Amino acid sequence: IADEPVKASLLLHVLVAHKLKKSLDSIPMSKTIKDLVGGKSTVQNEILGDLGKEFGTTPEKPEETPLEELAETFQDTFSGALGKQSSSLLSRLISSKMPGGFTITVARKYLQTRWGLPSGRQDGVLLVALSNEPAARLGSEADAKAFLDSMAQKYASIVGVDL
Amino acid sequence: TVSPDFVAATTNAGYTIELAGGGYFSAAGMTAAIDSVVSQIEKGSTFGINLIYVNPFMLQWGIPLIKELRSKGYPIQFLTIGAGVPSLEVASEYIETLGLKYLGLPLLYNFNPDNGFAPISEVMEDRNQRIKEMYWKLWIDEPFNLDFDPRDVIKGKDFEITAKEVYDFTHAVGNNCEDFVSRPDRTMLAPMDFAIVVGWRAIIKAIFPNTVDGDLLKLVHLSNGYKMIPGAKPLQVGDVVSTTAVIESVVNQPTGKIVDVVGTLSRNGKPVMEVTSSFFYRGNYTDFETLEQKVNLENPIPIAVLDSYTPSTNEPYARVSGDLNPIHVSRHFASYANLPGTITHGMFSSASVRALIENWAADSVSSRVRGYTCQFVDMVLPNTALKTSIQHVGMINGRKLIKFETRNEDDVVVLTGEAEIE
């Protein structure tokens, strides 16, 4: 019913967790961008470039800002855009980490009949599964369909919907 | 517990008694005012601002500013927050992330018991000029002259490739290609990384100038690339090469300085091939003194993803290449740089990934490989596994490029880049 839109509060945390090998539970909103990176020189430069390409609005200090301040300030300027770097990472996970048969059109249509989600909540469910994807890839159509049912209940705490 | 900016001269008159800050309620404003007061006081004093634990906004912003000041070199040695004591995990995390007291070459200096905390330490007077004599004497065989600049370029001497130096480098690198083979009645040429070892003496002179200084202990290899000329064969063992490059713009970064090097190669007067190098030096300095034509891809076509092993003893590998980095041999020089251990060299570790890419794609053939670029992100320690990877990049007029990705033990990107083959 009430599909959650592609806000910057959940899209920025999933993109930074995939490049630093983390999940949504470990990356807290009270931490900072430079304190959660670990302190490496290579990890600090890649986190600043990935956040500006997926949002658009580049601030002054992207690493010194916290997770709750940088994601909230970029939500007013973004209107649910797909992004240049965020669209390439989501399409590659459907072919490498998943098998042939569940593309972007089959994943968005399954959420409207088994959970009641349109195109707004379709991008949020696929972005949460890419940041916490396992090392074992799918090899059939039954493996990709089972991940969509489990993602509707685990990501329901940040949207507020039932099965 | 009322004044805030009145401790600029009271703490420099002997010792800090009850120096607190109850008027500084700004997040970024309190950090900038504390740095300006330390420069106007005596060199060797102790400061220490107390955070406000009563408000939630002041305690969250003050904890992040205290962690960045401890890693830069501040005089904050005491921090006693108000509103009672903290929690069991809040008080324990501040003692491990911030070094406070409590709450509630040459190595000689004149000792003097008159400062208070420390007796005598290493002065910063001519620190870069005195430490440059130990690094220039391990590679350059001439006098130390800091009369160069980044706007000009000058080449060194020329050393011809001999058969004795190419035979010892093949057993230390581990490559059984057509160039590093031992067969009679057959002309054997050199590999892509064989000519860069002899020409590394002229490209490592980036810190020889007085304007291109910095931290010599943290001046590690950033990246290193190579590319062949258009329609040129590989060099054998008998011709010399030359390299001459400089830095056009201000080679700096947000946490230090950079270095832009681009060596070349000669072949009896005419050019042979080219190369590239990069160095990352830490510090804090800001003074300087057509369209889209790249290749693309349609799908991720993989080549190979085998594993390798780093060398445990880099004493015989660094001697045949002529590396100027003396902090990766003995354990005495590595303690001053505060690194994670005796890591491998930048040009020695990148040569193993470049030679192994042609053995899993071109069946160990140097006639098809022309370019080789490998950018080291992190440092790789000795005697450890190295997970290699390869992927298809793009074509370049009949020459399909191949990517590279070297991971660590904990699935960490330590080295990456992409090479060119055919």
- A132 CB-side CA count, 13 A: 16
Is residue B1 within 8 A of residue B7, CB to CB? The reply is no
User: Which ranges in chain A belong to alpha helices (H)?
Assistant: 8-19, 41-55, 67-73, 84-93, 104-114, 122-131, 141-154
User: What is the Cα gyration radius of chain B?
Assistant: 27
Distance (Å, whole) CA B377 – CA B349: 12
- A63 CB-side CA count, 13 A: 18
Q: Nearest Cβ partner of B378 from A30, A32, A40?
A: A40
Beta bridge partners of A131: none
**Technique used by the depositors:** cryo-EM
Is residue B307 within 8 A of residue B388, CB to CB? The reply is yes
A contact test, residue of B63, B68, B301, B407 with most A CBs within 10 A: B68
Q: Nearest Cβ partner of B300 from A32, A42, A96?
A: A96
Q: Which residue has the tokens 């990935």?
A: A50
Beta bridge partners of B172: none
Chain B positions touching A21 (Cβ under 8 A) are 411
Is residue B207 within 8 A of residue B135, CB to CB? The reply is yes
Chain B positions touching A35 (Cβ under 8 A) are 64, 67
The minimum CA-CA distance between A57 and chain B, rounded to whole Å, is 20
Chain B positions touching A96 (Cβ under 8 A) are 300
* CA dist list (Å): B323 to A120, B291, B416: 57, 39, 21
Is residue B166 within 8 A of residue B190, CB to CB? The reply is yes
Final resolution, Å: 5.8
B64 with A40: Cβ contact below 8 A:
no
- At residue B222, φ and ψ (nearest 5 deg) are -85, -60
Distance (Å, whole) CA B338 – CA B16: 31
Closest among B215, B310, B312 to B258, alpha carbons compared: B215
B contact test, residue of A42, A65, A88, A133 with most B CBs within 10 A: A42
Distance (Å, whole) CA B375 – CA B414: 9
- Cβ-based interface (< 8 Å): residues of A facing B: 21, 30, 32, 35, 40-42, 66, 92, 95-96
Distance (Å, whole) CA B171 – CA B319: 13
- Cβ-based interface (< 8 Å): residues of B facing A: 60, 64, 67, 255, 280, 299-300, 377-378, 411, 413
Distance (Å, whole) CA B238 – CA A19: 47
What residues contact residue B317 under an 8 Å CB cut-off, 6+ apart? B172, B173, B311, B345, B348
Chain B positions touching A92 (Cβ under 8 A) are 300
A40 with B60: Cβ contact below 8 A:
no
The minimum CA-CA distance between A35 and chain B, rounded to whole Å, is 9
- CA A157-A158-A159 angle, to 5 degrees, is 95
* CA dist list (Å): B404 to B302, B356, B372, B381: 10, 10, 10, 19
Distance (Å, whole) CA A153 – CA A5: 17
CA B418 to chain centre: 20
Closest among B74, B123, B62, B119 to B99, alpha carbons compared: B74
Closest among B214, B230, B231, B210 to B222, alpha carbons compared: B214
3-state SS of A127-140 is: HHHHHCCCCCCCCC
3-state SS assignment for residue B220: strand
Residues comprising chain A, all counted: 163
Is residue A121 within 8 A of residue A3, CB to CB? The reply is yes
Is residue B361 within 8 A of residue B303, CB to CB? The reply is yes
- Tokens representing B4 are 């805030």
